[PDB]
Design a protein around this ligand. Structure first.
Ligand SMILES: [Ca+2]
Ligand SMILES: [Ca+2]
Ligand SMILES: [Ca+2]
Ligand SMILES: [Ca+2]
Ligand SMILES: [Ca+2]
Ligand SMILES: [Ca+2]
Ligand SMILES: [Ca+2]
Ligand SMILES: [Ca+2]
Ligand SMILES: [Ca+2]
Ligand SMILES: [Ca+2]
Ligand SMILES: [Ca+2]
Ligand SMILES: [Ca+2]
Lengths: 140, 140, 136
């Protein structure tokens, strides 16, 4: 039962990868996103990833091909690496500016209060920062 | 009497380890590189390796620390690495096998450059690198 | 009461962790090397201030008697943070062993495990801030 909010989330996800917004994700854009989260896939590995879901033989990911990538590679059940990515100064917490820096690096423009609202939504213990438990919760 | 070519070789070597190119080698990058050559060092073993040469107490390898690592651990084991290179196990390393090893190591080389590497290391002129030629190549 | 030769030897070993060329004096450069091996990045002026405080005769370096005088004297949450490298709030066996190796006292896993177990109060296998302060 597809609904509009689901599609909006899919499109936000796709925008996180399609940096120039030209409708397809290239190997460069995919590799950039994977680098921003602490990984170094090679040109050949990225071409392999895209080739497994490419349907029109152009070496780039369009929207349905991206949804298929999600279906194939995402699973319910590595996390500490992502937390460390967000946790810039290594104090065990993700501050508002650290979240803002990650968001910005992903091409997302959020105002100060918007980042604070994200933090507040995910901040259970109310200390003003995101720890590992809260990060895992907001990621699943 | 350090020379420009030697510094270029030191930096090529360091680039083989500093995958993200941020100036220092982490335990993650060192472990990835060592796994690419058929070894499974543990987190603690990698931390120990870096600790024996660490001069600024951050658990990562910078350039002088990397040169010191070379001076300490290089000596005047090879069969495992050769087997790693020899993908199809026929006792020879072809151009595509060498090219894949190069790619996996984050090295971007054109086709003719790989052929020139073969030409340099292929003594008996058969167009592939056997074990003797592989060992001799890892000295010059 | 006179010191034993083993006492003097241990004092000289601790001094030699700073006086690394073994010429009997600790310069600002050598103290900086130590502090950097610990992860800190003190400026030359901070190092000079440390020296000045400890250099009672004013010749610009620390010698063995001045070092001993400092030893007779004993926040420290920064010293703890220096040992706790991953910042999880505890000092692990690997962390203590690595710190000591960088300082110049290479210890074995066995020795460090035993040493931490002897200083371990709550018995969780790691030295927390309170145990660190209590030992100090
Ligand atoms: Ca694009
Ligand atoms: Ca496509
Ligand atoms: Ca943080
Ligand atoms: Ca929180
Ligand atoms: Ca690096
Ligand atoms: Ca280092
Ligand atoms: Ca082969
Ligand atoms: Ca040959
Ligand atoms: Ca000295
Ligand atoms: Ca003096
Ligand atoms: Ca720790
Ligand atoms: Ca304890």
């Amino acid at each position: 039962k597809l609904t509009e909010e689901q599609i909006s989330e899919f499109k936000e996800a796709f925008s996180l990868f399609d940096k120039d917004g030209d409708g397809t994700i290239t190997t460069k854009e995919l590799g950039t996103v994977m680098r921003s989260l602490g990984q170094n896939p090679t040109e050949a590995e990225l071409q392999d990833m895209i080739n497994e879901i490419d349907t029109d033989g152009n070496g780039t990911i369009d929207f349905p091909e991206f949804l298929t990538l999600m279906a194939r590679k995402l699973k319910d059940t590595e996390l500490i690496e992502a937390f460390r990515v967000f946790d810039r100064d290594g104090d065990g917490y993700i501050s508002a500016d650290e979240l803002r820096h990650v968001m910005t690096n992903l091409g997302e423009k959020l105002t100060n209060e918007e980042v604070d609202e994200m933090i507040r939504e995910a901040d259970i213990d109310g200390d003003g920062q995101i720890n590992y438990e809260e990060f895992v919760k907001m990621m699943i």
